[PDB]
Design a protein around this motif. Sequence first.
Motif, PDB file in Angstrom:
ATOM      1  N   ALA A 198       0.681  -1.442   0.034  1.00 37.31           N
ATOM      2  CA  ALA A 198      -0.018  -0.333  -0.144  1.00 37.31           C
ATOM      3  C   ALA A 198       0.657   1.422   0.178  1.00 37.31           C
ATOM      4  CB  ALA A 198      -1.221  -0.181   1.439  1.00 37.31           C
ATOM      5  N   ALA A 199       1.704   1.469   1.037  1.00 31.23           N
ATOM      6  CA  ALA A 199       2.726   2.516   0.874  1.00 31.23           C
ATOM      7  C   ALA A 199       3.485   3.004  -0.780  1.00 31.23           C
ATOM      8  N   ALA A 200       3.801   1.499  -1.886  1.00 31.21           N
ATOM      9  CA  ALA A 200       4.152   2.236  -2.771  1.00 31.21           C
ATOM     10  C   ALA A 200       2.597   2.229  -3.437  1.00 31.21           C
ATOM     11  CB  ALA A 200       4.530   0.342  -3.034  1.00 31.21           C
ATOM     12  N   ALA A 201       1.773   2.029  -3.451  1.00 30.67           N
ATOM     13  CA  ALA A 201       0.751   2.237  -4.176  1.00 30.67           C
ATOM     14  C   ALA A 201       0.441   3.621  -3.968  1.00 30.67           C
ATOM     15  N   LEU A 202       0.615   3.559  -3.412  1.00 34.27           N
ATOM     16  CA  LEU A 202       0.292   5.239  -2.787  1.00 34.27           C
ATOM     17  C   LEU A 202       1.270   6.364  -3.047  1.00 34.27           C
ATOM     18  CD1 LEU A 202      -1.973   5.534   0.385  1.00 34.27           C
ATOM     19  CD2 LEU A 202      -2.897   6.359  -1.443  1.00 34.27           C
TER      20      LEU A 202
END
Length: 13
Positions: A1-5
């Motif tokens: 998620a960190a990467a997605a955002l």
Amino acid sequence: AAAALAAALAQAL
């Protein structure tokens, strides 16, 4: 998620 955002924001700006 960190990467997605992170990437989402990078693009948005």
